[PDB]
Design a protein around this ligand. Structure first.
Ligand SMILES: [Zn+2]
Ligand SMILES: [Zn+2]
Lengths: 115, 148, 260, 67
């Protein structure tokens, strides 16, 4: 009667975009990234990778409502840096981490199966 | 300088009323140079303190070695010379009370400054001479270092 | 400001589970990998049923739901098949789904077990795990003399985020800091708690001394496979899918920075 | 009414273990030892086999609608 399809949590509706960037006028050099059809899986890793950047002053995320399927990521950086640049570098670092982890897991399987 | 008070204290007792909180302990200490009593709540989990320990306590209005006010906002990406570098345990709080033995006609010979570091309470009481730097509703730092 | 350099150490690898340790990574990365094991590793599962005849004592939705939960070998085929969202065909085609038939009738007196072995596929690579060449076959329904079940299923690509039938795992054990050194748990009575299998403590000592400067490193995983994929294939798919989500997010991010 | 396919909790397949479980039980295994023989570690899967009531066996005592 009122059950949303299970694909709604991860599929995107037409005309609604994956990520939206919004100044935060609160404080300088802060942005809100509203990411649609993602959840804690990406929000947590992006936030923690951003917390590794010493030029990031604030990094946080929230799922505003569990029944809704978007996350907000707030990023504040130092004035010489940009929250968009910080977000990009965090994603790049996560990708490189996962590529390295994948290659090393392949090697570890390789070794386990043959010795 | 920005230093309201500086002295060397000796831990005389820890939790006389018993352990109330697991990661926080109350030290009852007394100095030697000024004869000031101190009650201090410290996070013993990260900065353990044993009975009989001796430490230097510095109540300061600012961390910057040059006279410069603080904004009360957390700025980890700050490169100026901070006096927190010289110390091990640093807390930031506000003075919420100043008692004294004053009468309706006489001024206070002994004062008692109460500070709150985010709920960790301190009472520094002794001669009013040494507690002129304290106003109520004023932000201060702890700057405590253990010495042998 | 840059990526971790995680290392991996696989301590057990069977057809049923993989037990490994990831070391020098962040807890968020470790938990996202754990979550992707469960929710974003695609496999093949029956997601469309047409009951042509069902005289059994279980109604049609019961049979359909039961067929959806049968694991299908998805090892090399899942990467090749498309989502039916992405396929440019009609309802079905061999590029986005796999056909199954089942047609059983109990003639004898004596109860006929319609099992996953009766699910006949058009694709030899995608078959029920129990049917793969020990463990018995998954029981779909018991039929009495005169009862009959004839149906036609289609299996599609999906992941556990849509339905648990596309979840390839049969339990993902995840642990870190087996000795409570970070004190992320606070035992009222630490002596009463059993030791972790990964604990490295003498029996007199209940938990490790508190580490003020530590964080979570060295996460222990035991990924058990339901059968559709190998466990190492589950882990490799999980890493690829998590990565590759991050790549899509990056692409959209670049467009959105561009457009401003 | 019939053995579930997956464990409700973890998703381990238990639908191929009911018949083997009963065979082990008539072979004079204890229920715990039988569950151990089938590889059900976790008390969720042990719950699935140990608490199952095979009602379908009773539903098959009725003649079907068509001969
Ligand atoms: Zn197609
Ligand atoms: Zn289970």
């Amino acid at each position: 009667m009122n059950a949303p399809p299970a694909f709604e949590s991860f599929l995107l509706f037409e005309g609604e975009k994956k990520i939206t960037i919004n100044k935060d006028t609160k404080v300088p050099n802060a942005c809100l990234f509203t990411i649609n059809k993602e959840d804690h899986t990406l929000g947590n890793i992006i936030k923690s990778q951003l917390l590794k950047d010493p030029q990031v002053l604030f990094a946080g995320y929230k799922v505003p409502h569990p029944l809704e399927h978007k996350i907000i990521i707030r990023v504040q950086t130092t004035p010489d840096y940009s929250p968009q640049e910080a977000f990009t570098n965090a994603i790049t670092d996560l990708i490189s981490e996962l590529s390295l982890l994948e290659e090393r897991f392949r090697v570890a399987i390789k070794d386990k199966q043959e010795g | 300088a920005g230093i309201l008070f500086e002295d060397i204290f000796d831990v005389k007792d820890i939790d006389p009323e018993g352990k109330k909180f697991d990661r926080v302990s109350r030290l009852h200490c007394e100095s030697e140079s000024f004869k000031m009593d101190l009650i201090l709540d410290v996070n013993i989990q990260i900065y353990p303190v044993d009975l009989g320990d001796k430490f230097r306590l510095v109540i300061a209005s600012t961390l910057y070695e040059d006279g410069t006010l603080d904004d009360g906002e957390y700025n980890p990406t700050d490169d100026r010379p901070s006096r927190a570098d010289q110390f091990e345990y640093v807390m930031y709080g506000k003075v919420y009370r100043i008692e004294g033995d004053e009468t309706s006609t006489e001024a206070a010979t002994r004062l008692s400054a109460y500070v709150s570091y985010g709920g960790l309470l301190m009472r520094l009481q002794g001669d009013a001479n040494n507690l002129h730097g304290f106003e109520v509703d004023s932000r201060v730092y702890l700057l405590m270092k253990k010495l042998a | 400001p840059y990526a971790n350099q995680p290392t991996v150490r696989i301590t057990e690898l069977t057809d049923e589970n993989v037990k490994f340790i990831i070391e020098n990574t962040d807890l968020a990365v470790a938990n996202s990998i754990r979550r992707v094991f469960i929710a974003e590793v695609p496999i093949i599962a029956i997601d469309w049923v047409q009951i042509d005849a069902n005289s059994s004592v279980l109604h049609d939705e019961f049979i359909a739901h039961r067929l959806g939960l049968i694991p299908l070998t998805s090892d090399d085929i899942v990467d090749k098949l498309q989502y039916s969202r992405d396929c440019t065909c009609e309802e079905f085609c061999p590029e986005c789904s796999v056909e199954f038939t089942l047609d059983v009738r109990c003639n004898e007196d004596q109860t006929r077990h319609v099992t996953s072995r009766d699910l006949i596929s058009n694709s030899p690579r995608v078959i029920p795990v129990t049917s793969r060449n020990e463990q018995d076959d998954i029981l779909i329904v018991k039929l009495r003399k005169g009862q009959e079940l004839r149906l036609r299923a289609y299996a599609k690509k999906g992941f556990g985020k849509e339905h648990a039938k596309w979840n390839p795992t049969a339990g993902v054990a995840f642990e870190y800091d087996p000795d409570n050194a970070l004190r992320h748990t606070v035992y009222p009575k630490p002596e009463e708690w059993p030791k972790s299998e990964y604990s490295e403590l003498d029996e007199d000592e209940s938990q490790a001394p508190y580490d003020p400067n530590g964080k979570p490193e060295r996460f222990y995983y035991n990924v058990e496979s339901c059968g559709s994929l190998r466990p190492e294939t589950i882990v490799l798919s999980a890493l690829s899918g998590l990565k590759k989500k991050l790549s899509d997010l990056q692409t959209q991010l670049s467009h959105e920075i561009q457009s401003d | 009414m019939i053995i579930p396919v997956r464990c409700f909790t973890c998703g381990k397949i238990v639908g191929n273990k009911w018949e083997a479980y009963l065979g082990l039980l008539q072979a004079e295994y204890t229920e715990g030892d039988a569950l151990d023989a089938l590889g059900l570690k976790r008390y969720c899967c042990r719950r699935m086999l140990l608490a199952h009531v095979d009602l379908i066996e009773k539903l098959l005592n009725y003649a079907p609608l068509e001969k």
